[PDB]
């Protein structure tokens, strides 16, 4: 009989049951989308979009709905932080309900197509065999895909007929769903420009419509038909898996590096913003601009938004988690409650000392305090090691500007040492760790989880593409090579050309 | 060979009835298992 | 709610072990002829 890993090969010459199986898969995927949205809605806390946003809560499908325009719920809250509000039908709950209903309808259609598999449409008119004209199918589907891409770009994303898409400031402070005009210049190929996304969808939709018309109207060359085995559906599977792993690598890359389609208000910061000290540079720029205008350090640091300080914290870095550390980011350091302010460290001369920040590579990092030149002035020694730069011997004090402890100053060495140990992570925050029994061990954001899943899937789909391309190109020999295979065909110096009987010497 | 071996049968109706019994018992007793 | 956590595995086993049993029997009934 059939081996287990080949059971679905009963569908190869059965177009109706293949459609039924595809409908069943589509029903399963849509039902997953609806049920995942409902689970996330049941677990989501919308009360604090500043210090407990969706990417701190392990929300996976909520940022995508928010990306394309769904920002409100029927309960009255919004992800931007508004209460009241009218999202209409297309709230998060409405989207989830539409997906569940769609899953049920596709399940029923799959049942119908499984029972009524023997349709005249799937049979070749002049031979009566089950046949699918795959090139014209590709033309029809490409025309439909081009129409849908053009409509999504020209109506949804533009805001002509639709909500637009999520756009944001460069520092993720004031993001909202806005209509986006297409950018037709070279800056449309900036991946951080949403107008480029709109222009892409308009232009690529038009090109897809034209190419779909071309593939409907003109037939494949005989050379390409034989070479690519266009009468075999497995060649479609091979090339489709190839295109699919290409797109999976692309989406993994754009999620990890960031783009206009992966905003940090929905997926969290990237690791490269921690690497380049992006938010720290912006915070220092704003603090210096406040200081030059004539404010003191307390007022300059009290003007920094808590959200901007929260981005400048390594617990929000997606490269700080673990493979088997499960759950939301709040399961790690805790739920952020309030910014404690900026910690300024001084010695007994009152000269400013700077804590060296932890790189993403290090699971643990020592506490080292240097002056502005870069020479070490203080540190916390490793456990019981002897010292000459300890916090006691050089009188390290910490003063907090802005936040909860604005205007305070600590001098007792255990408190100062604990604040320095927290300051290696960047900005210091107050965390509630009791609500979820947080263990203090960092987890990654949905950005990291998405990138991991899609890179792994892309690699496995490279193997799948290889396997199915090998199967379609070598279909005549996959039950074994010819029993009567000539030794002269495989020996040297018998044919001039390899595998060509006609070139016999 | 043992001559006492006999085939075992379970029709689809018995499958549906047994699945109904198991699932309804699970729905009944799950609240008490969680408690 | 503060439920017994083992209830989950209990319920799952209570679903899985008998039903699987029936499924096994049913499938091996369908392959006999």
């Amino acid at each position: 009989g059939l081996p287990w890993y080949r059971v679905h090969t009963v569908l190869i010459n059965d177009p109706g049951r293949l459609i039924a199986a595809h409908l069943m898969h589509t029903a399963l995927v849509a039902g997953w989308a609806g049920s995942m949205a409902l689970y996330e809605l049941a677990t989501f806390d919308p009360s604090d979009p500043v210090l407990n946003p969706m990417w701190r809560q392990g929300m996976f499908v909520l940022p995508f709905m928010a990306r394309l325009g769904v920002t409100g719920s029927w309960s009255g809250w919004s992800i931007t932080g508004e209460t009241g509000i009218d999202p209409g039908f297309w709230s998060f709950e409405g989207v989830a309900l539409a997906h569940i209903v769609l899953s049920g309808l596709l399940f029923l259609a799959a049942c119908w197509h499984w029972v009524y598999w023997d349709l005249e449409l799937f049979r070749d008119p002049r031979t009566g065999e089950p046949a699918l004209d795959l090139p014209k199918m590709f033309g029809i589907h490409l025309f439909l895909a081009g129409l849908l891409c053009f409509g999504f770009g020209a109506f949804h994303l533009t805001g002509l007929f639709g909500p637009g898409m999520w756009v944001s400031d460069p520092y993720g402070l004031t993001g909202s769903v806005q209509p986006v005009a297409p950018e037709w210049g070279p800056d449309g190929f900036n991946p951080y420009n949403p107008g480029g996304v709109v222009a892409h969808h308009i232009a690529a939709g038009i090109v897809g419509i034209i190419a779909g018309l071309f593939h409907i109207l003109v037939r494949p060359p005989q050379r390409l038909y034989k070479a690519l085995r266009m009468g075999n559906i497995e060649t479609v599977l091979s090339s489709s898996i190839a295109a699919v792993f290409f797109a999976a690598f692309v989406v993994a890359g754009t999620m990890w590096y960031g783009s206009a389609t992966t905003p940090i208000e929905l997926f969290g910061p990237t690791r490269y913003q921690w690497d380049s000290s992006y938010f720290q540079q912006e915070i220092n720029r704003r603090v210096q601009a406040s200081l030059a205008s004539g404010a003191t350090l307390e007022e300059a640091w009290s003007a920094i938004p808590e959200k901007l300080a929260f981005y400048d914290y390594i617990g929000n870095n997606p490269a700080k988690g673990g493979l088997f550390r499960t759950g939301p980011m709040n399961k790690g350091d805790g739920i952020a409650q309030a910014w404690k302010g900026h910690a300024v460290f001084r010695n007994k001369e009152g000269e400013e000392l700077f804590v060296r920040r932890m790189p993403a590579f290090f699971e643990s990092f020592p506490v080292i305090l240097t002056d502005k030149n870069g020479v070490v002035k203080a540190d916390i020694p490793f456990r019981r090691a002897e010292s000459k730069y300890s916090f006691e011997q050089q009188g390290v004090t910490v003063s907090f500007y802005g936040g909860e402890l604005n205007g305070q100053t600590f001098t007792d060495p255990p408190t100062v040492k604990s604040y320095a140990r927290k300051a290696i992570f960047g900005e210091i925050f107050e965390f509630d760790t009791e609500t979820l029994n947080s263990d203090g061990i960092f987890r990654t954001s949905p950005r990291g989880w998405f990138t991991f899943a899609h890179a792994v899937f892309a690699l496995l789909f490279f193997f799948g593409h290889i396997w199915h391309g090998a199967r379609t190109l070598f279909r005549d020999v996959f039950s074994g090579i010819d029993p009567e295979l000539s030794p002269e065909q495989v020996e040297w110096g018998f044919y001039q050309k390899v595998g060509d009987v006609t070139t016999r010497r | 060979p043992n001559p006492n071996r006999q085939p075992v049968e379970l029709n689809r109706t018995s499958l549906y009835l047994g699945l109904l019994l198991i699932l309804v018992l699970a729905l009944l007793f799950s609240s008490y298992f969680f408690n | 709610m503060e439920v017994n956590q083992l209830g989950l595995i209990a319920t799952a086993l209570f679903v899985l072990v008998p039903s699987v049993f029936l499924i096994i029997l049913y499938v091996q009934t369908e392959s006999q002829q």
Partner: peptide
């Protein structure tokens, strides 16, 4: 996970209703 368990068992029961009605073994006369 409690609510998930209850809803999952209920959904399994409804699916079993569907299969028991529309995919039953047909009764055959004689």
């Amino acid at each position: 996970m409690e609510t998930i368990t209850y809803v999952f068992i209920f959904a399994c029961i409804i699916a079993l209703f569907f299969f028991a009605i529309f995919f039953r073994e047909p009764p055959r006369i004689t």
